[PDB]
Q: What sequence folds into this?
């Protein structure tokens, strides 16, 4: 297939993940109150049942997806795409 996307290098640091240095798209809140990317937290759980930047205990049942960031991210990505013709 020939499918492709706009480069999101213009995204703010509150939309980007720290490990992969890109737009997370799925923000997920931890029991510490910290927000992380869905894929980075589940990738660290495979190594140990702990947080990726502090190693306090963490389980999948303690996680909750963030709506107020995900709904802002999808609106922002729409404007980056509609700027092209």
A:
């Amino acid at each position: 297939p020939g499918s492709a996307e706009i480069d999101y290098s213009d995204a703010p640091d509150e939309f980007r993940d720290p490990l992969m240095d890109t737009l997370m798209t799925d923000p997920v809140r931890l029991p510490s109150g910290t927000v992380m990317d869905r894929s980075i937290i589940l990738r660290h759980l495979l190594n140990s049942p702990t947080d990726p930047f502090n190693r306090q205990m963490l389980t999948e049942s303690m996680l909750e997806p963030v709506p107020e960031l995900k709904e802002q991210i999808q609106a922002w990505m729409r404007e980056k795409q509609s700027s092209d013709h």
About this structure: Strands lie at 27-29, 35-37, 64-65.
